[PDB]
Amino acid sequence: SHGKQFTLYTHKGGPNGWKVTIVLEELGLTYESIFLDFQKGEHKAPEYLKVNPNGRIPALIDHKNNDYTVWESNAIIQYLVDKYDKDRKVSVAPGTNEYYTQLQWLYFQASGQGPYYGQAAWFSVYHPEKVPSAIERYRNEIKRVLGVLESVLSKQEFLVDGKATVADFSFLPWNEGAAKFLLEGSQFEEEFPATAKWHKKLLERPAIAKVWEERAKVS
Amino acid sequence: SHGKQFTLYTHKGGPNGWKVTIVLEELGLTYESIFLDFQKGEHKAPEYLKVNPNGRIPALIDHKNNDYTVWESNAIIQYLVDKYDKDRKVSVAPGTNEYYTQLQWLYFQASGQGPYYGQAAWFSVYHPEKVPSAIERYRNEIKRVLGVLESVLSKQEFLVDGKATVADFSFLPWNEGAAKFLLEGSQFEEEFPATAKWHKKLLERPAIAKVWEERAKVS
Ligand SMILES: N[C@@H](CCC(=O)N[C@@H](CS)C(=O)NCC(=O)O)C(=O)O
Ligand SMILES: N[C@@H](CCC(=O)N[C@@H](CS)C(=O)NCC(=O)O)C(=O)O
Ligand SMILES: N[C@@H](CCC(=O)N[C@@H](CS)C(=O)NCC(=O)O)C(=O)O
Ligand SMILES: N[C@@H](CCC(=O)N[C@@H](CS)C(=O)NCC(=O)O)C(=O)O
């Protein structure tokens, strides 16, 4: 209905739709973003459940692949680079050892960064009572995850050693949350300097900077 | 030294090492399980951090691929089926649409099931303070995830619809937690009958049943 290769179901504020948008833009692909209104329950409405039965964003429909539909941000991202980064600008080749190292880092992001950072967000902002021990638990886990990244990034430039890939990009949106709200003050920058430098440089890439400007705009 | 194709770093009780063991056994692969003693801090010791800097299990070393090492259970699983399930017994082919649907489900498991079930376990069993609102939050999230699975499994046999795959298997260890204590009583079986039946039948597969005996032995 719109002349773009993809329909992307997303959200204006949350990190995970922007994660996919970063990759779409890095790959030079066209997309129509449908921003769901969570306050109106649109992500739980039958119209969206037929797209993603989990009732969460993002979800992607590829109109140049017979409307193939896939959800989970990092599954979407793998689909996008495997099919549409054949020049390997921001990904490694399927069927190589490095591919499974890329995949390892993408799972660490999706299972180790996102959910735990998200529980810090939950207890700090949304939970109906203030539970300092829960807030502290998840802040400490954010710092533990950052420490893992720091242990690697202090010794090599990027996660899949030689070049920036979607494995690196996948951590950006949630780490921007750590930088701006989930940790107090400048703790991200001063406690994890190698990670903070890597993060900053990725955000300055032209496609990522473009997406981040758009995120600020739609807000 | 042990003569097996793989070294698997694991834990006797937690779900995520067993997840990989299921796949190793389904594929008829040989492996030496090294059960780390978390009470002794073995998962945080410098020698294990050289294997997985995250300091969590599982991690896999493939001695028939020049000691290629990969961590994150679902990255390990993908490596194993892509390289060693060319007969497509329990996986779909790389480079197909269905591969990315399999991947979607694997990411839903790793990011949507495991972390959230794990926080139910944390608040119910390990957090110093008993926090009823946190316990309720994660019990409700277990049920929400089970409802997603139910919505699919009540309409088709397996997740990647007609074939049992590692996408289905990946849910087993944490759903066994739901079945046996994380949800009290018979809530799992009564409230999610299609999911419970699918779970039961998967545990009856010969390879998985064998793994479950090992899990019982070491308990
Ligand atoms: N692991 C999922 C997480 C998706 C997720 O957390 N989405 C959020 C927005 S950032 C959402 O839709 N939240 C609505 C809700 O769950 O109520 C992925 O990476 O796609
Ligand atoms: N229904 C959600 C609402 C909040 C939500 O969706 N949070 C997202 C971020 S927008 C989250 O924590 N996602 C986890 C992840 O990214 O893995 C909940 O109860 O946590
Ligand atoms: N997303 C990771 C989760 C791994 C995980 O939670 N491992 C647990 C055992 S079930 C662990 O090593 N826990 C020790 C710790 O974190 O202190 C994966 O699927 O491999
Ligand atoms: N350091 C861990 C200790 C407990 C732990 O490792 N729990 C594992 C299960 S053994 C977990 O919840 N893993 C989450 C997952 O499987 O994604 C924590 O603070 O949560």
> What is the distance between the terminal CA atoms of chain B, rounded to a whole angstrom?
26
Resolution (A): 1.1
Residues A135 and A203 in one domain: yes
State the distance from the centre of ligand 4 to the C-alpha of B153, rounded, in angstroms. 27
Q: How many structural domains compose chain A? A: 2
Furthest C-alpha separation in chain A: 50
Give the domain-ending residue among A90, A109, A128: A90
Burial B191-202 (b: 16+ CB within 10 A, else e): ebebbbebbeeb
Give the domain-ending residue among B59, B90, B121: B90
Q: What is the 3-state secondary structure (H, E, C) of chain B?
A: CCCCCEEEEECCCCHHHHHHHHHHHHCCCCEEEEECCCCCCHHHCHHHHCCCCCCCCCEEEECCCCCEEEECHHHHHHHHHHHHCCCCCCCCCCCCHHHHHHHHHHHHHHHHHHHHHHHHHHHHHHCCCCCHHHHHHHHHHHHHHHHHHHHHHCCCCCCCCCCCCHHHHCCHHHHHHHHHHHCCCCHHHHHCHHHHHHHHHHHCCHHHHHHHHHHHHHC
Contact (CB, 8 A) for A37 and A10: no
Residues B96 and B84 in one domain: no
Q: Are β-strands B68-71 and A31-35 bridged in parallel, bridged antiparallel, or unpaired?
A: unpaired
Instruction: Tell me the two tokens of residue A100.
Output: 């499974």
> How many other C-beta atoms are found inside a 10 Å radius of the C-beta of residue A217?
8
Find residues 45-64 of chain B whose CB sits inside 8 Å of chain A: 49, 53-55
3-state secondary structure of A28: coil
Residues B193 and B210 in one domain: yes
Residues B199 and B109 in one domain: yes
Contact (CB, 8 A) for A199 and A157: no
Residues B37 and B59 in one domain: yes
Q: CATH number for the domain including A107? A: 1.20.1050.10
> How many other C-beta atoms are found inside a 10 Å radius of the C-beta of residue B50?
9
Residues A140 and A70 in one domain: no
B60 phi/psi in degrees, rounded to 5 = -130, 135
Nearest-Cα residue of chain A relative to residue B116: A115
Instruction: Tell me the two tokens of residue A105.
Output: 């880092």
Residues B103 and B40 in one domain: no
Interface test with chain B among A57, A80, A104, A144, by most B beta carbons within 10 Å: A104
Q: CATH number for the domain including A30? A: 3.40.30.10
- Bridge partners of B214, per DSSP, are none
Residues B120 and B104 in one domain: yes
| Amino acid code (one letter) for A103 | L
Cα A61 to Cα A120: distance, rounded to the nearest angstrom: 31
Residues B190 and B85 in one domain: no
Residues A119 and A205 in one domain: yes
> How many other C-beta atoms are found inside a 10 Å radius of the C-beta of residue A43?
19
Q: Identify the domain containing residue B104 by its residue range.
A: 91-219
State the distance from the centre of ligand 4 to the C-alpha of B118, rounded, in angstroms. 6
Give the domain-ending residue among B90, B112, B127: B90
Residues A8 and A53 in one domain: yes
Residues B156 and B82 in one domain: no
Tell me A29's DSSP state.
-
| Contact criterion met (CB < 8 Å) for B107 and A110 | yes
